[PDB]
Design a protein around this ligand. Structure first.
Ligand code: PRO
Length: 710
């Protein structure tokens, strides 16, 4: 099958660094420079072989055509009210970017409010964050170009959708919060740095500050409200309390679900927002999470994990702040994780729980925390919600593996709440009734039972002859819940595959204990859990090693790259998207410093010892057995992928091609594809999404020789 030659890549054999006594060679360290002629040549050379390999099989065109047909279904966001108008996002089907619409009433004629498609020919300019003024008459929105995390904030007057001249630059990982007087808005920005700031640079992001922009002024006049000169890594996001009296500052350092919480009573400012605010340091440590829900006077309701791994709701009275005085409003559940909470219709709380990786939604009384109503839902996830404290109705969107989903609506002014279907779309061509989703629990190496969802065609024989696609993330307290993917269903219907999603440790499926069970010294638990998922699928007859493909992106990219190194015998194909591969230097680039809470940092001897054992870049080794080679591998990244810089993938593929690719027994391809005008993934235009999934499934089809089923 292999009919190409890997490109020549210079090895700097002098690049040696000592890590606590352990010498480490990094011969491809020069790929860390994105703008060098050497790196640019490397990328061109790699793409030169990858593209023809992916496009040789007619299967790619068949998949692409099918994906284009099936993905063409109306896509709506929940309606949300702001001021006197309703807004919602809607994509007719194949538009590159969804459009924001506005209407005067739920039964009124809708009109376009903001169409990002006219901002670029290829749909590479996308909305990234937005905030309406309290009265709903002004609108702030962020725009990101080419997939970069960098944002430029723009403004509009809602009535007439008039563009305003206000423009804010250097915005990244920013809050957006208008003061209720409608005078200005809080946002975050970074200091000037040498080089570029378009997503192609690798420069670390430090010293983020909180500013206040007065509408109608130039950004140069913005007020600095908070900064942390002695703590370069801290990031403070502002939000206004529902009554607009307080500014709450949530300060974070890293990715752990914890934050300091300071507040500023705006009424106590000597003369408005003129400089650093009179911050009151309510919670001045990083011991727990405090997510504002609402407040009634000085009594603030927060969702927290303080002494509660599955989360709970507590009330802190600012006038009697000591912990011994806090009141528990809704106690922690023994197993179900409280994911999020919203306050609506003045005194109702909407609580969303995760029960065995499926969402449940319920209404509670704010005063007592008592359960009032359970909103019926099928097995799946809640992926959209609308309903503020001044609102008198809620909208929520549900999705699952087999259906795009439904948006429900509930008028909360009615004595007997009756949720009703507001919007429901069906995908013609895919009969959900022909497939099934099951949830099993498999034991890992240490005996821990791990959940896994498996989706397949009803009635298949578990003889191990089916191609399988196993997905995992495993980290950062992220829960991987059911979601609708037409791309994966085409693999099931047209390639005869089985889909599996493993809820390994490191995620937040079972609260903080689940997260802590897969980080730092225990990161290897993630990998063991994922490898055990693969073993289960094989033992149970869903697939065989040669027909199994594993996929993950970002921390999930690290996941699959590590599994390829540790158990190359268990997989036939590996697809890693925007993955972290150099665990020794990840903290040196862009926002990488934030991930040390999950991984540790090589600067520490103890941490280095954990990292070196699994860092993909440092564990590529020819399999000992003559009959075992590495699985076919495809790494995907992009020029503006500034969350997890491309250098990780570039150095990893160079190493794979040299160490493994040069061996006589290696016949499976080891390829990388670097896309242009794209980033980490958020905001990717539909056209690119279709191309990407088409590449992925074409790779799988070619490497495993899978026949298309019309
Ligand atoms: O999406 C991700 O996984 C990146 C890398 C780890 C933390 N955030």
């Amino acid at each position: 099958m292999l009919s190409f030659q890997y490109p020549d890549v210079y090895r700097d054999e002098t690049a040696i660094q000592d890590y606590h006594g352990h010498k480490v060679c990094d011969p491809y360290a020069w790929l860390e420079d994105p703008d060098s002629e050497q790196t640019k040549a490397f990328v061109e050379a790699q793409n030169k072989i990858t593209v023809p390999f992916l496009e040789q099989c007619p299967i790619r065109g068949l998949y692409k055509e099918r994906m284009t047909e099936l993905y063409d279904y109306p896509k709506y966001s929940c309606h949300f009210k702001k001021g006197k108008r309703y807004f919602y996002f809607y994509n007719t089907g194949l538009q590159n970017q969804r459009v924001l619409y506005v209407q005067d009433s739920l039964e009124g004629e809708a009109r376009v409010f903001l169409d990002p498609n006219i901002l670029s020919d290829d749909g590479t300019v996308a909305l990234r964050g937005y905030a309406f003024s309290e009265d709903g008459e002004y609108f702030a929105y962020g725009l990101s170009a080419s997939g970069s995390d960098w944002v430029t904030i723009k403004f509009m007057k809602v009535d007439g959708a008039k563009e305003l001249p206000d423009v804010l630059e250097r915005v990244k990982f920013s809050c957006m919060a208008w003061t209720h007087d409608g005078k200005g808005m809080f946002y975050n920005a970074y200091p000037q740095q040498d080089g570029k700031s378009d997503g192609t640079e690798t420069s670390t992001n430090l010293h983020q500050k909180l500013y206040y922009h007065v509408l109608g002024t130039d950004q140069s006049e913005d007020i600095l409200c908070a900064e942390f000169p002695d703590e370069p890594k801290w990031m403070g996001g502002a939000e206004l309390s529902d009554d607009g009296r307080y500014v709450l500052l949530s300060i974070r350092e890293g990715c752990d679900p914890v934050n300091r919480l300071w507040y500023c009573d705006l009424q106590q400012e000597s003369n408005g927002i003129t400089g650093i605010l009179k911050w009151v340091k309510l919670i001045d440590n990083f011991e727990g999470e405090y997510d504002y829900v609402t407040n009634e006077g000085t009594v603030f309701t927060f969702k927290t994990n303080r002494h509660s791994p599955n989360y709970r709701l507590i009330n802190i009275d600012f006038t009697d702040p000591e912990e011994s005085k806090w009141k528990v409003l809704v106690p922690e559940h023994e197993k179900d994780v409280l994911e999020w909470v919203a306050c609506v219709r003045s005194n109702f709380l909407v609580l969303c729980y995760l029960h065995d990786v499926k969402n449940t939604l319920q209404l509670h009384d704010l005063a007592t925390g008592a359960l009032l109503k359970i909103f019926p839902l099928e097995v799946g996830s809640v992926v959209g919600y609308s309903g503020q404290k001044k609102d008198t109705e809620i909208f929520y969107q549900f999705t699952s593996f087999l259906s795009p989903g439904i948006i429900y609506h509930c008028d909360l002014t009615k004595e007997e709440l009756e949720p009703r279907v507001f919007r429901e779309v069906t995908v013609k061509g895919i009969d959900a009734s022909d497939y099934q989703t099951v949830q099993i629990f498999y034991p890992s190496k240490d005996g821990t039972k791990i959940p896994m969802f498996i989706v397949h065609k009803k009635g298949i024989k578990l003889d191990g002859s089916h191609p399988a696609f196993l997905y995992g993330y495993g980290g950062f307290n992220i829960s991987i819940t059911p979601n609708y993917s037409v791309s994966r269903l085409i693999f099931v219907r047209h390639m005869g595959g089985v889909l599996a999603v493993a809820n390994i440790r490191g995620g937040g499926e079972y609260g903080e204990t689940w997260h802590k069970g897969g980080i730092l010294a225990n990161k290897q638990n993630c990998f063991d859990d994922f490898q055990c998922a693969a073993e289960y699928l094989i033992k149970e007859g869903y697939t065989s090693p040669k027909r199994l493909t594993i996929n993950g992106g970002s921390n999930g990219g690290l996941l699959v790259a590590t599994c390829a190194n540790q158990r190359p015998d268990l997989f036939g194909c590996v697809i890693a998207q925007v993955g972290v591969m150099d665990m020794l230097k990840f903290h040196k680039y862009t926002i990488g410093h934030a991930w040390t809470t999950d991984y540790g940092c090589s600067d520490s001897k103890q941490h280095f010892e954990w990292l070196i054992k699994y860092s993909p870049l440092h564990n590529v080794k020819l399999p000992e057995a003559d009959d075992i080679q590495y699985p076919s591998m495809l790494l995907l990244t992009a020029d503006h992928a500034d969350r997890v810089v491309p250098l990780h993938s570039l150095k990893f593929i160079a190493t794979l091609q040299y160490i493994v690719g040069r061996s006589r027994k290696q016949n499976n391809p080891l390829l990388i594809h670097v896309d242009t005008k794209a980033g980490h993934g958020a905001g990717k235009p539909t056209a690119k999404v279709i191309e990407e999934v088409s590449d992925m499934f074409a790779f799988i089809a070619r490497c495993l020789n899978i026949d298309w089923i019309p």
